[PDB]
């Protein structure tokens, strides 16, 4: 504690800031939750229990803000509330991440599970899981000559670190990769469909302006090769594909005339394609471009916001712990270890006030967040 006089200003500053910011943010959060006290489809329940964890972590804080060098059961309660803050934050962020991944990869399986029963079941499952994560680290009373809770053959450290932090990190990352690939694969698909439509229109134009039927054949074959894989991208998709079936039929009707050698009759039979387009595919291109942005944009920014809150609040502390224990197995103690864990715990508790930043762009009543 060589920097205790420094800490006497550092930690009350940071924890006062965290207390006031997280308290007023979660205050307005649960007020807007009261404003929508029933409609919690699948994500608002995750957000509300994470709010519960954060606000109990804050209501157990005003004892710890009054600190100096200088009970025991109250200190054990502070330890358990810290752990049910951090582990609940991690596991609920990753369950909300897999919720978004299920929603924006298999939406039918999402609507299968969008009901309150299975969602609240998985919620209470990870809630009893985080209650199972905190009690094993509560054996001895931390009082030693305040608490002196900081230090302490240990082997369960990296096991808890892995299960507690490492597995969750890999999950959110693969969920983000799946979301980015699914949103990037229905992107190149729309790009190639627009390219097919553009080459179809350009070759129709060169048909209607060209002579010398040896090139109206060259335009019609490109038009057909475009239509055949434009139709590849249910009772409405059937009427989408029937329009392209009759379009390719008209293409063939023009192409056999071009093969016979009637360049005027071929442009006459190719003229009907714009009529077929306007009657069948113009009213579907707007849907295919606009609807298939919106909910998935909310999902993408929610995943990336969970990733950045993760990698700036739970990564420093846990890599600090794996660094402090990687010193083991090979063999002053308060040099470059106490201030490191001090500031990384400050980050792992700063997640509690960075958590309204999740809601104001992600879920749980963004009305006053926009206001």
């Amino acid at each position, epitope marked *: 504690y060589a920097h205790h006089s420094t800490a006497r200003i550092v930690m009350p500053l940071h924890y006062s800031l965290v207390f006031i910011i997280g308290l007023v943010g979660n205050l307005l959060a649960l007020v807007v939750i009261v404003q929508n006290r029933k409609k919690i489809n699948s994500t608002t329940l995750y957000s509300t229990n994470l709010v519960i964890s954060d606000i109990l972590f804050t209501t157990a804080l005003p004892t710890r803000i009054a600190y100096y060098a200088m009970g025991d059961a109250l200190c054990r309660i502070t330890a358990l509330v810290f752990y049910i803050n951090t582990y609940a934050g991690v596991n609920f962020m990753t369950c909300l991440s897999i919720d978004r991944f299920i929603a924006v990869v298999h939406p039918l399986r999402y609507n299968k599970i969008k009901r309150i029963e299975h969602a609240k079941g998985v919620c209470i499952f990870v809630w009893i899981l985080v209650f199972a994560q905190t009690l094993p680290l509560l054996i001895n009373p931390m009082s030693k000559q305040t608490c002196m809770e900081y230090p302490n053959l240990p082997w369960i450290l990296l096991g808890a670190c892995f299960i507690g932090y490492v597995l969750p990190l890999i999950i959110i990352l693969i969920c983000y990769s799946q979301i980015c690939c699914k949103l990037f694969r229905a992107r190149r698909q729309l790009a190639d469909l627009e390219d097919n439509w553009e080459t179809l229109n350009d070759n129709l134009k060169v048909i209607e302006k060209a002579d010398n039927a040896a090139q109206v054949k060259d335009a019609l*074959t490109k038009m057909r*090769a475009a239509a055949l894989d434009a139709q*590849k991208a249910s009772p409405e998709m059937k009427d989408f594909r029937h329009g392209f079936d009759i379009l390719v039929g008209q293409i*063939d009707d023009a192409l*056999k005339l071009a093969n016979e050698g009637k360049v005027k009759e071929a442009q006459a039979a190719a003229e009907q394609l714009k009529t077929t387009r306007n009657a069948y595919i113009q009213k579907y291109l707007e849907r295919a471009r606009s609807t298939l942005s919106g909910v998935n944009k909310k999902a993408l920014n929610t995943i990336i916001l969970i990733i950045v809150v993760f990698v700036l609040c739970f990564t420093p502390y846990h890599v600090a712990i794996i660094q402090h224990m990687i010193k083991k197995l090979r063999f002053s103690q308060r040099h470059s270890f106490q201030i490191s864990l001090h500031f990384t715990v400050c980050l792992m508790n700063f997640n509690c006030c960075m958590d309204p930043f999740i809601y104001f762009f992600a879920c749980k009543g963004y009305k006053r967040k926009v206001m």
Partner: antibody
Amino acid sequence: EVQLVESGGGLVQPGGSLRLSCAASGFNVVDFSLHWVRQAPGKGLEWVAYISSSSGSTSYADSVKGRFTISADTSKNTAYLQMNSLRAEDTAVYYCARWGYWPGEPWWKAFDYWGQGTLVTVSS
Amino acid sequence: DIQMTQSPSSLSASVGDRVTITCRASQSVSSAVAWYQQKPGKAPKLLIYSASSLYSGVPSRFSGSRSGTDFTLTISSLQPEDFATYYCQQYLYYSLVTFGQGTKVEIKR
């Protein structure tokens, strides 16, 4: 069962004439377009001509245009290929294929039922 | 007029290998190419149509796929009866049929 049969191959003089006949059984030649794919001895396959007796769309390869004429007498359920003015490089095995009309899976399958092929020999 | 180049003009492999034959189009036909197999002396046989879909009647070791204008036929476990010439036909219109040059899979030794 659908089963194609060719006939009419043999020896001809360079510049002569010949008539191949692709008899069909099972399906009818109205519902399908009958093609002719030939394969020179020791070479790859090449497309020659086709006919679509549902409409009439006799087209030919660039190397046999004006020299071959394809007919389809659907009362006999066969298709014919009249090869006259035969050059020396026209010796091959002439297969007869089958291709369904658009739209749907009959078109998306290519030549799925071929004949056994008849061999012609253009020699002097 | 659409060229169709089939590159590995002769493969050598043994019973149980995994061979792969590729095929590239001049223009950009859609997923309309077919793969054939011609045992010497007989007529061809359809294996793949629509560039990926397996024809009904052939074993499931053959499996084609498509990437742009690069079509490829893969055999997974090369049984001793898969030793023949494999062609590559595009079918975009009736009068625009062009076959590949045909690769001859043969016995490694």
